[PDB]
Amino acid sequence: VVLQRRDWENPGVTQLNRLAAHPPFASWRNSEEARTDRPSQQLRSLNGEWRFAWFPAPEAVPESWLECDLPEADTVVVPSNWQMHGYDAPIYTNVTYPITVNPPFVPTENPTGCYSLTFNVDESWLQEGQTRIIFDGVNSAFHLWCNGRWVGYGQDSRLPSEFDLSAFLRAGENRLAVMVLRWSDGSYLEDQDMWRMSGIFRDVSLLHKPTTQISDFHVATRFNDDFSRAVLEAEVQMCGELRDYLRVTVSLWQGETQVASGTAPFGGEIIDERGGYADRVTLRLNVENPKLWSAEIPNLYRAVVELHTADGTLIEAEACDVGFREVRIENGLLLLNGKPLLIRGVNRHEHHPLHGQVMDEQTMVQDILLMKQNNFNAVRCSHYPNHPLWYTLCDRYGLYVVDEANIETHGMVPMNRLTDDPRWLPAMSERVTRMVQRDRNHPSVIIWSLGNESGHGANHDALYRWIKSVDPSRPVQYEGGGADTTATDIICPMYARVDEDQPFPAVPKWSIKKWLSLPGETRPLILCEYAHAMGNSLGGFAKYWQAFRQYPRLQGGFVWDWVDQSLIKYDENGNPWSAYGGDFGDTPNDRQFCMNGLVFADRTPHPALTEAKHQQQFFQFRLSGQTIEVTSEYLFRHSDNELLHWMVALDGKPLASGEVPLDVAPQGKQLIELPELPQPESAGQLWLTVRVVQPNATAWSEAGHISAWQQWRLAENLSVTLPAASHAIPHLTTSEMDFCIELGNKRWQFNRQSGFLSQMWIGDKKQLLTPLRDQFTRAPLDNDIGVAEATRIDPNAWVERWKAAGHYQAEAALLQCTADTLADAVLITTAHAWQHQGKTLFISRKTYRIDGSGQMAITVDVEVASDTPHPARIGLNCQLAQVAERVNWLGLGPQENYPDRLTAACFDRWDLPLSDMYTPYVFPSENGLRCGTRELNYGPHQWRGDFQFNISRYSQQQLMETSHRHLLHAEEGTWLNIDGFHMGIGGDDSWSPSVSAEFQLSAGRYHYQLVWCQK
Amino acid sequence: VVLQRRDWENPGVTQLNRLAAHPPFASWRNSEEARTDRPSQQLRSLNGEWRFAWFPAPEAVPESWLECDLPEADTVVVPSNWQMHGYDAPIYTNVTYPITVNPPFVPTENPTGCYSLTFNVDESWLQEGQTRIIFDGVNSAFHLWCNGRWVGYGQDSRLPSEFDLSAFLRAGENRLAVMVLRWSDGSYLEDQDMWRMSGIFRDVSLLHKPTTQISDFHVATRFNDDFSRAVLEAEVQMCGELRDYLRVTVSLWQGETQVASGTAPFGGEIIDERGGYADRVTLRLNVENPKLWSAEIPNLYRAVVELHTADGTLIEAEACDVGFREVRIENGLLLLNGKPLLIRGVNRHEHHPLHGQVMDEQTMVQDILLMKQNNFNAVRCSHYPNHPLWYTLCDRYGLYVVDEANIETHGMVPMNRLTDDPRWLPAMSERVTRMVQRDRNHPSVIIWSLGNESGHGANHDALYRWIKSVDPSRPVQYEGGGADTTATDIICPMYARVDEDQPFPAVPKWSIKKWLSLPGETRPLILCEYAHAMGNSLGGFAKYWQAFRQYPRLQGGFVWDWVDQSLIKYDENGNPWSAYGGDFGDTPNDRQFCMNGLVFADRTPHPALTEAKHQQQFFQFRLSGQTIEVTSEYLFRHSDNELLHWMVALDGKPLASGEVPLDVAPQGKQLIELPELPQPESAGQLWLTVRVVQPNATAWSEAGHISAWQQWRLAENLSVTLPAASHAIPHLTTSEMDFCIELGNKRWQFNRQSGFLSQMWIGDKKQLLTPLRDQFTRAPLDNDIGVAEATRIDPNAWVERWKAAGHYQAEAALLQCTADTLADAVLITTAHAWQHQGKTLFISRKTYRIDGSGQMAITVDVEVASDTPHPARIGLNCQLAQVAERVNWLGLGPQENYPDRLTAACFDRWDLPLSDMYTPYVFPSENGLRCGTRELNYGPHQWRGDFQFNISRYSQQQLMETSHRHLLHAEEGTWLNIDGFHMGIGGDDSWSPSVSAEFQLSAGRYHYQLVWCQK
Ligand SMILES: [Mg+2]
Ligand SMILES: [Mg+2]
Ligand SMILES: [Mg+2]
Ligand SMILES: [Mg+2]
Ligand code: NA
Ligand code: NA
Ligand code: NA
Ligand code: NA
Ligand code: NA
Ligand code: NA
Say which CATH number the domain at B403 has.
3.20.20.80
Strand partners, A648: A656, A688
Q: Which residues of A touch B1 (CB under 8 A)?
A: 1, 4-5
Instruction: Tell me whether A1 touches chain B (CB under 8 Å).
Output: yes
CA distance B182 to B751: 65
Signed CA dihedral, B613, B616, B620, B623: sign only: positive
Query: What is the three-class DSSP state of A738?
Result: strand
Q: Which of B533, B537, B588, B520 is nearest to B565 (CA)?
A: B533
Residue A386 has phi, psi (to 5 degrees) of: -90, 170
- Please pick, among A190, A350, A453, A479, the residue that the annotation labels catalytic: A453
* Residue ranges making up the domain that contains A314: 211-325
Task: Check: CB of residue B189 under 8 Å from CB of residue B408.
Answer: yes
Number of A to B CB contacts under 8 A, please give it: 154
Q: Are residues A196 and A232 in the same domain?
A: no
Q: Measured between CA atoms, how close is A663 to chain B, in angstroms?
A: 48
3-state secondary structure of A934: strand
Expressed in Å, this structure's resolution amounts to 2.0
Name the DSSP class of B422.
Answer: G
What is the spatial distance between Cα A515 and Cα A512, in angstroms, rounded to a whole number? 5
CA distance A1014 to A939: 9
SS3 category, A558: strand
Nearest to B1 among A5, A277, A416 (CB): A5
With contact defined as beta carbons under 8 Å apart, do A195 and A352 qualify? no
Query: How far is residue A783's CA from residue A992's CA, in Å, rounded to a whole number?
Result: 8
Indicate yes or no: CB of A429 within 8 angstroms of CB of B433: no
Give the span between the Cα atoms of A521 and A517, in whole angstroms.
6
* Beta-carbon contacts of residue A122 (< 8 Å; ≥ 6 apart): none
Based on the residue annotation, tell me whether B529 is a catalytic residue of this protein. yes
Name residue A111's amino acid: P
CA distance B418 to chain A (A): 12
User: What 3-state class would DSSP assign to A961?
Assistant: helix
Residue B893, domain CATH: 2.70.98.10
Nearest Cβ partner of B15 from A12, A456, A469?
A12
Residues B531, B649 within the same domain: no
Do the chains contact at A423 and B275, CB–CB below 8 Å?
A: no
Does A476 contact B at CB distance below 8 Å?
no
User: Please, which residues have CB within 8 angstroms of residue A453's CB and are 6 or more apart in sequence?
Assistant: A191, A383, A408, A409, A410, A415, A479, A480, B273
Nearest C-alpha neighbor of A839 from the set A816, A861, A811: A811
Distance B191 CA to ligand 4 centre (A): 7
For residue B263, give the nearest of B214, B220, B312, B301 by alpha carbon.
B312
Cα Rg of chain B (Å, integer): 33
Sign of CA dihedral B641, B613, B709, B618: negative
Q: HSE of A740 in the Cβ direction (CA atoms, 13 Å)?
A: 13
Residue B503, chain A, CB below 8 Å: the answer is no
Please tell me the distance from the alpha carbon of residue A611 to that of residue A538, in angstroms, as a whole number: 8
Residue B109 is a catalytic residue: no
Q: Which residues of A are annotated as a binding site?
A: 94, 193, 408, 410, 453, 529-532, 589, 593, 596, 991
CA distance B372 to B369: 5
The residue of chain B with its CA nearest to that of A486 is B469
The Cα angle at residue A346 between residues A344 and A349, in degrees rounded to 5: 160
* Type of residue at B591: R
Nearest to B279 by CA among B241, B327, B245, B250: B241
Antiparallel, parallel or unpaired: β A48-55 and A112-121: antiparallel
Residue B264 — φ and ψ, nearest 5°?
-155, 150
- CB B353 within 8 Å of CB B602: yes
Judge if A669 and A521 occupy the same domain: no
Q: List beta partners, residue B569.
A: B577
CA distance A287 to A500: 49
If phi > 0 it is left, if psi is from -120 to 50 it is alpha, else beta; for residue A101 that is: beta
Beta bridge partners of B416: none
Q: Which helix (H) or strand (E) holds B802?
A: helix B798-805
Give every CB contact of residue B445 below 8 A, 6+ residues apart in sequence. Answer: B391, B394, B401, B402, B403, B439, B474
CB atoms within 10 A of CB A735: 9
Cis peptide before A107 (omega within 30 of 0): no
Strand order across the beta sheet in which B149-154 lies: B15-16, B149-154, B141-146, B172-181, B112-121, B48-55, B74-78
Closest by Cα among B880, B776, B790 to B836:
B776
Q: What sign does the dihedral B767-B768-B773-B777 (CA atoms) show?
A: negative
Give φ, ψ of A59 to 5 degrees.
-65, -25
Please spell the DSSP secondary structure of A426-471, one letter per residue: HHHHHHHHHHHHHHTT-TTEEEEE--SS----HHHHHHHHHHHHH-
How many angstroms separate the CA atoms of B988 and B991, rounded? 9
A786 CA distance to ligand 7 middle (Å): 13
Angle between helices B458-470 and B425-439 (to 10 degrees): 30
CB contact under 8 A, B455 and A274: yes
- Tally of CA atoms within 13 A in the half-sphere of B956 that contains its CB: 23
SS3 category, A915: helix
Question: Best interface-test mutation with B: which of A19, A237, A273 has the largest number of B CBs within 10 A?
Answer: A273
d(CA A1001, CA B199): 79
Strand-pairing partners, residue A314, are: A308
* Residues A835 and A919 placed together within one structural domain of the fold: yes
Map residue B601 onto helix, strand or coil.
coil
DSSP-assigned letter for residue B940 = T
Q: Are residues B776 and B747 in the same domain?
A: yes
The whole-angstrom separation of Cα B798 and Cα B794 is 9
Structural determination approach = X-ray
Cβ-based neighbours of B900, under 8 Å, separated by 6 or more = B539, B540, B984, B985, B986, B995, B996, B999
Of A683, A705, A722, the residue at which a domain comes to its end is A722
The answer to whether the Cβ–Cβ distance between A413 and B275 falls below 8 Å is yes
Order of strands across the sheet with B257-265? B257-265, B246-254, B301-309, B314-322
Coil, helix or strand for B506?
Answer: coil
- Under an 8 A CB cutoff, do A272 and B480 touch? yes
- Asked if B1010 and B517 touch (Cβ cutoff 8 Å), the reply is no
Same domain, A192 and A339: no
| Minimal C-alpha gap between A442 and chain B (Å) | 20
Cβ-based neighbours of A620, under 8 Å, separated by 6 or more? A549, A630, A631, A633
User: Are B117 and B221 within one domain?
Assistant: no
Measured between its terminal Cα atoms, the distance across chain B in Å is 85
My answer on whether A128 and A10 are in the same domain is yes
How far off is chain B from A469, nearest CA to CA, in Å? 6
- Nearest residue on chain B to A482, judged by CA atoms? B272
- In a mutational test of the B interface, the residue from A14, A270, A272 whose CB has the highest number of chain B CBs within 10 Å is A272
Query: Is B400 within 8 Å of B341 (Cβ atoms)?
Result: yes
A464 in contact with B at a CB cutoff of 8 Å? yes
DSSP notation for A19-84: PPP-S----BSSHHHHHTT---TTEEE--EEEEEEEESSGGGS-GGGGTS--TT-EEEEES--TTT
Helix or strand run (H / E) with residue A152: strand A149-155
> Does residue B359 sit in the same domain as residue B296?
no
Question: A470 and chain B: CB distance < 8 Å anywhere?
Answer: yes
For residue A987, CA distances in Å to A535, A542, A729, A901, B102 come to 9, 12, 51, 10, 59
Please give the DSSP secondary-structure letter assigned to residue B677.
P
Provide the chain A residues 273-302 that lie in CB contact (below 8 A) with chain B: 273-278
Is residue B746 a contact partner of residue B740, using CB atoms and an 8 Å limit?
Answer: no
Find the CATH number of the domain harbouring B111: 2.60.120.260
Asked if residue B52 lies in contact with residue B72, where contact means CB atoms within 8 angstroms, the answer is: no
State the Cα angle at B919 between B914 and B923, rounded to 5°: 140
What distance in Å separates residue A535's CA from the closest CA in chain B? 25
What radius of gyration do chain A's Cα atoms show? 33
List, in sequence order, every residue forming a beta bridge with B689; answer none if it has no partner.
B647, B711
Protein residues with C-beta less than 5 angstroms from the ion ligand 3? B 7, 10, 13, 185
Give chain B positions within 8 Å (CB) of A13.
Answer: 12-13
Number of domains in chain B: 5
User: B963-966 long-range CB contacts below 8 Å, 24 or more apart?
Assistant: B963/B923, B963/B924, B964/B577, B964/B578, B964/B579, B964/B922, B964/B923, B964/B924, B965/B577, B965/B578, B965/B920, B965/B921, B965/B922, B965/B923, B965/B924, B966/B571, B966/B575, B966/B577, B966/B578
CA atoms within 13 Å, Cβ hemisphere of B1000: 14
Chain A CB contacts of B468 under 8 Å are 461
DSSP symbols for B683-728: -EEEEEEEEEEE-S--SS--TTEEEEEEEEEEEEE---PPPPPPS-
Instruction: Give the list of residues 6+ apart from residue B331 with CB closer than 8 angstroms, or none.
Output: none
Residues ≥6 apart with Cβ < 8 Å to A144: A133, A150, A151, A152, A153, A154, A163, A176, A177, A178
Shortest distance between the Cα of A505 and any Cα of chain B, in A, equals 7
Helix (H) or strand (E) holding A611: helix A608-615
Burial A340-354 (b: 16+ CB within 10 A, else e): bbbbbbbbbbbbbbe
What distance separates the 2 farthest-apart alpha carbons in chain B?
A: 113
Distance separating alpha carbons of residues B500 and B481, to the nearest angstrom: 20
- Do A402 and A446 touch, CB atoms closer than 8 A? yes
Distance from the first to the final alpha carbon of chain A? 84
In 3D, which of A323, A601, A589, A357 has the Cα closest to residue A473? A323
CA angle B971–B973–B976, rounded 5-degree value: 95
Preceding omega of B104 cis (within 30 degrees of 0): yes
Distance CA B872, CA A418 (A): 64
User: Of the ligands numbered here, which is closest to the C-alpha atom of B340?
Assistant: 8
| CA-angle at A432, arms to A429 and A438, nearest 5° | 130
SS3 B29: coil
Instruction: Check whether residue B117 and residue B263 sit in a common domain.
Output: no
CA–CA distance, B151 with B142 (Å, rounded to integer): 11
Of B325, B341, B371, the last residue of a domain is: B325
Q: How many angstroms does the Cα of residue A793 sit away from the middle of ligand 6?
A: 17
Q: Give the DSSP letter of residue B296.
A: S
In 3-state terms, chain A is what percent helix, strand and coil (to 5)?
15, 40, 45
- In Å, how far from its chain's centre is CA A900? 19
Q: Which residue of B has its CA nearest to A417?
A: B277
CB–CB contact A413 B14 (8 Å): no
Q: What angle do CA B187, B189, B194 make, to 5 degrees?
A: 75
Chain A residue whose CA is closest to B465:
A462
Domain boundary (B325, B342, B367) is at: B325
CB contact under 8 A, B462 and A458: no
Q: Report the DSSP beta bridge partners of residue B447.
A: B402
DSSP state for residue A201 in the 8-state scheme: -
- Under a CB-based contact definition with an 8 Å cutoff, are residues B515 and B524 in contact? no
Q: How far is A699 from A369, CA to CA, in rounded Å? A: 8
DSSP A269: P
Whether residues A187 and A96 fall in one domain = yes
Which is the catalytic residue, given B529, B800, B926, B935? B529
B532 CA distance to ligand 9 middle (Å): 9
The Cα–Cα gap between A642 and A708 comes to 10
**Of A20, A272, A456, Cβ closest to residue B507:** A272
Cα gap A101→A108, rounded to integer Å: 13
Q: Which amino acid is at A149?
A: R
Q: Is B189 helix (H, G, I), strand (E, B) or coil?
A: helix
How wide is the angle at C-alpha B49 spanned by C-alphas B43 and B52, nearest 5°?
115
Q: B20 contacts in A (CB within 8 Å)?
A: 423
- Give the span between the Cα atoms of A310 and B562, in whole angstroms: 53
* A4 near B CB under 8 A: yes
**Is residue B380 within 8 Å of B560, Cβ to Cβ?**
no
Q: Is A52 exposed, middle or buried (0-12, 13-18, 19+ CB in 10 A)?
A: buried
**Any CB–CB contact under 8 A between B244 and chain A?**
no
Q: How far is B275 from chain A (nearest CA, A)?
A: 5
SS3 A411: coil
d(CA B61, CA B114): 8
Orientation angle between helical segments B425-439 and A425-439, nearest 10 degrees: 150
**How does strand A343-347 pair with strand A554-559?**
parallel
Q: Which residues of A touch B506 (CB under 8 A)?
A: 269-272
Question: Could you tell me the CATH number of the domain that includes residue A297?
Answer: 2.60.40.10
CA A224/CA A338 separation, integer angstroms: 11
Nearest CA in chain B to A483: B272
Residues A217 and A316 reside in one and the same domain: yes
Task: Report how far residue A192's alpha carbon sits from residue A382's, in angstroms, rounded to the nearest whole number.
Answer: 9
